[model samples]
Target: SPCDTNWRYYGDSCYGFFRHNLTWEESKQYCTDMNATLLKIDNRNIVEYIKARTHLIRWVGLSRQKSNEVWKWEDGSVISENMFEFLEDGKGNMNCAYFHNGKMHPTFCENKHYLMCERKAG
Candidate 1:
């Protein structure tokens, strides 16, 4: 299969939302173990595609270590532009982000949420 048969196709990619919640790190590992990356919100349409598929809130593929101010993708590359809206909860050592209200919010990495995995379409 190009992507898993269970995953839904949209744009040039396929998406799968793991309903079972997991810590941000665990979710990320799971996506990688399956050969996909946690969904990286690079544009409005990608966010909307995920929203249309799930009603539950979920973690995406953006994070930064406390010492590193630049937000990075799953591959650890700096995001080049304002691809998505960035907002923080304004508390704690929060370093991860998730989709909410059509935007991403910085949240604590330990907070558990469903995982959204993405892979290029075949």
Candidate 2:
């Protein structure tokens, strides 16, 4: 279970919970710079793991460019149906998703928040 310094190894991946506040796009770039990707919760185990560890809202890798566009993970995969509720903010323009209180919510991409990053375990 190889992971970078300060990252925690869990399941089949390495997770980094960063405290720096940044916008969704900025958070994504930060993860990229670390050779990881913004958190992608593709399974219940990972979701529970994150929920248990996070005490604040954090930017994840789910987003869409436009209001009508389908939500997609950073890795180009569509979100699974019923995986998590997409809480509506009524803003209609919020294209990014963040994890908070054990759920994902839509928010403006420019909104700043802490972030989670992940990559495969070596």
Candidate 3:
């Protein structure tokens, strides 16, 4: 289950890696296979948590395949332009989203890092 955790929580939500490693189109299928969106971001809760948590820049669930940058959140919500890190590109080639570490540089998300997922303590 840990191995699948990336796909399970790549972003703040139950997200999937776009396999951004692949051709853009191929990455879409990667998300589809897991019932996860490519990588749309949510609130500051998820935003700051991700920065402090992983500092990763994985290709997440946001894309304007039809429109240039119609970014949205995980719940089909529109992405908030006011979010500080929303459009910041830590990774130089980022056409997709990932939590940035660039404010510090070199330690950014391109490095393969593990992300954490939350589970109810119940």
Each candidate: RMSD: 2.3, 1.6, 7.1
**How many clashing pairs does model 1 include?**
0
Best by TM-score: 2
Per-residue lDDT of 114 in model 2: 98
Q: Report RMSD for candidate 1.
A: 2.3
Candidate 2 ranges beyond 4 A from true positions: 86-90
TM-scores of the models, in the given order?
Answer: 0.84, 0.91, 0.49
| Local accuracy by lDDT, each model | 0.79, 0.86, 0.43
- How would you encode candidate 2's per-residue C-alpha lDDT over 37-72 as one tens digit per residue? 998887777778888888799999999978868889
> Candidate 2 clashing pairs?
none
lDDT of 3 at 91: 36
Lowest lDDT sum, 10 consecutive residues, model 1, at 84-93
Ranking by lDDT: 2, 1, 3
Off by over 4 Å in 3: 1-20, 66-69, 73-76, 89-95, 102-122
Query: Alpha-carbon error at 83 in model 3, in Å?
Result: 2.4
Q: Which parts of model 1 are misplaced by more than 4 Å?
A: 84-89
- Candidate 3, residues 8-99: lDDT per residue as tens digits? 44332443333234433454455565554444445665655556545444544443324244545445665666554556543333333444
Highest lDDT, which number? Answer: 2
